[PDB]
Structures are given as C-alpha cells and as structure tokens.
With several copies, the nearest count.
Chain A
Amino acid sequence: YKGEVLGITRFGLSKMRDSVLQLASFEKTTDHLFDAAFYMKKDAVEGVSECIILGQTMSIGTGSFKVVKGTNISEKDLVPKRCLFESLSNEAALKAN
C-alpha cells in the first residue's frame, strides 16, 4: 500500500511506520532513536505501541470513541438573569452630561 512491495523485516517496517518509538521497540532500537534525534523527527503518539509505552489509551477497540454523559439541563433556566440593571443605565451619553 505504500506503492512498492515492502517486507515484514526491520527494513520493510522502517519504510512503513513513521513512529520512532514503535520502530525502536521492534528492532534496531538505538540506531532508530539516534536517527530520530539527529533528523529531529516529530512523531505523534497514536499507535498502540506508542500508547502502551507512554501509558495511554489506544485508538482501536474500546478506545476508538468517547463516552459522554448528557447534562440534560433545560434552556428555560440557563438564560441570563438580572433584576433591571438597564434602568439606571439610560445611556447618559444621550444627554449632554
């Protein structure tokens, strides 16, 4: 799917997965880490190995979505409430002083 036939060795994986931590975990750790330090790679942790190494939640399985609890609050009380402030604020700029 990258365009060319790529193996499942440490050479064919290095041309598929950008994640430096995943490649280091698989094979050729120090070389990959030093190359990522030199070329200053900026991997975004989204793979399962990246999340496991950093103690996060994966993007596959039960971590592929979110759980949200409906607040269930009416729109008839969340409206702003005040007791006639605009009375004394009759826009004093309308008159001369």
Chain B
Amino acid sequence: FILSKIADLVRIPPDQFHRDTISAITHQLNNKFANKIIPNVGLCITIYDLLTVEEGQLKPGDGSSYINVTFRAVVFKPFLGEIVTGWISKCTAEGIKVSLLGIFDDIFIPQNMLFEGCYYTPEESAWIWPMDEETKLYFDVNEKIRFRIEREVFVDVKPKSPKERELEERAQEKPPAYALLGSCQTDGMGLVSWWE
C-alpha cells in the first residue's frame, strides 16, 4: 500500500451543504475513488488525507459547488521487493489464477518462472511438482500460496465503435484492467506451511 497524490475537481450538490465540507469532499472522492483502478497507477482503496483545498466555484447553470482539491489516496502497487500470499479459485492448463479474500482476483501467474517439475493435470486440476522421488507436492485449491510479482500489465485501451458495440450486444474483450504477473523462481512458494 502506497500513498498517491492526486488533484481533482469535486462536485458538491446543495443537498450536502449542511454537513462538514471535508466530509462532503471525502464522500465525493470516495464516490469516484472507492474501489476503482486509477489508470497507470493501480487500484485505489480509500481517500486517506486531504490538503490544499481551494474555494469552490459555481457554474452558471447547475447551482452546486465545484471545488479544486488535492489529496493523498491509498493505492496498492508492489513492484519488485515483495512476497504476497493468496488463495486459489480456479485453475486450468494455462497457468494458475491466485485470488484474495475480496480485494481483487485479477492476478494470474503462469509456469514460466515457476518450479521446473510443475506440469498440468486436466483431472483433479493441480500443480504436481515432484522435485524429488516423492511427487506428492501438488498445489491445492483454496489454500495459502506465496508468490512474487515480476511485472504489472495495464489494460488502458478502448478503440470501440458504436456499430461494434451494437454488433457485440447482438452477438452477446480483455475484462482485466490492472493485473500482475507472478513468479516463484525461488523456494518458499506454493504454501506458507510447506516450507516450515
């Protein structure tokens, strides 16, 4: 978790003029930055602080209060010096997707920088990895698994056409927008209890 520093413009409707101004500012910022991915920086958790608030301005047709504000948001962005635990939701023969307990389930780690003995198994989908004469070291679903993050992918493109939107709706894309690629080159991964 890392503090950011973002400057934005906040619309305060007259309904919220009675409460504290900072409370309304934080409410609107949360309405914009609660559990959403800020492009090129990751996912924002909660508006932490608030500093350098300029006097609000009114446009000639709405009657709200538009305030230019700066604040320090809470975002998650681990690059290299980290080890992250997670759970397992679904696995198939193209890698393993590691999930958390509600934060976000977008981390997918393939078997590129993983253990050499890992292999696929359509049945009892698992990550069998002998590494010795004993081959009973398969990865189980819904268990602690530690992994490193080697790189982060940002999907920040949208060249879609209205005709294409209508065609896809009649026929109904890369849903992820902030995913991290995992690595388990060193030991101690797979389960925090396997390595003592």
Q: Do chains A and B touch in the complex (CB under 8 A)?
A: yes
Q: Measuring CB to CB, which residues of chain A are less than 8 angstroms from any residue of chain B?
A: 57, 63, 66-73, 77-82
Q: Which of B82-138 contact A (CB under 8 A)?
A: none
B60 A80 Cβ-Cβ under 8 A: no
**Min distance, Cβ B47 to any Cβ of chain A, angstroms:** 13
**Min distance, Cβ A89 to any Cβ of chain B, angstroms:** 13
Chain B, interface size category, equals 10 to 19
**Given contact pairs A78-B52, A79-B51, A71 touches B21 in the complex (Cβ within 8 A):** yes
Q: Which residues of B contact A77 (CB under 8 A)?
A: 22
Total A-B residue pairs with C-beta atoms closer than 8 Å? 39
1/0 per position for B52-77, CB-CB distance to A under 8 A?
A: 11111110100001010000100000
Contact of B21 among A72, A81, A82 (CB under 8 A): A72
Q: Which residues of A contact B22 (CB under 8 A)?
A: 73, 77-78
Contact of B51 among A57, A72, A78 (CB under 8 A): A78
| B50 interface hit (Cβ, 8 Å) | yes
**Given contact pairs A57-B60, A67-B58, A69-B58, A81 touches B49 in the complex (Cβ within 8 A):** yes
**Min distance, Cβ A59 to any Cβ of chain B, angstroms:** 12
Contact of A68 among B21, B58, B72 (CB under 8 A): B58
A and B contact pairs by CB, cutoff 8 A, 17 listed: A67-B58, A68-B55, A69-B58, A69-B65, A70-B56, A71-B21, A71-B53, A71-B67, A73-B21, A73-B53, A78-B22, A78-B51, A78-B52, A78-B53, A79-B51, A81-B49, A82-B49
